[PDB]
């Protein structure tokens, strides 16, 4: 499914993401656009053989079982496939757990490099939230 900016924003808000662990909605939309361009199916390798899945590019090295990732754990006790459905719910649940890992949203390379410390609310905006 490829979301537009606002569609995902409402979706993320509906799912409880504006200010989950103090991260406003704009943070969650920002990071998705740069992790996955809002493509719920987006997948990417990682140089270590792990794989990033879904709207927030959630990594099989730790967080989901894709059955083919060396030194990997399945901390969200979910198959990486579940992060790809047009339903963002699996992705949101794992990322709620990921952000409470104590690293916060720095879990997301793109959020840290391209969202952190910017006016993130410019991502929701003009959106019928
Ligand atoms: Ca934090």
Swiss-Prot record:
Domain C-type lysozyme: from-to ranges: 1-129
Family annotation (Pfam families): Lys
InterPro entries, alphabetized: Glyco_hydro_22 (IPR001916), Glyco_hydro_22_CS (IPR019799), Glyco_hydro_22_lys (IPR000974), Lysozyme-like_dom_sf (IPR023346)
Annotated SUPFAM superfamilies: Lysozyme-like
Reported tissue expression: In the egg white and polymorphonuclear leukocytes.
Assembly: Monomer.
Record's protein name: Lysozyme C
Organism: Gallus gallus (Chicken)
Gene name of the encoded protein: LYZ
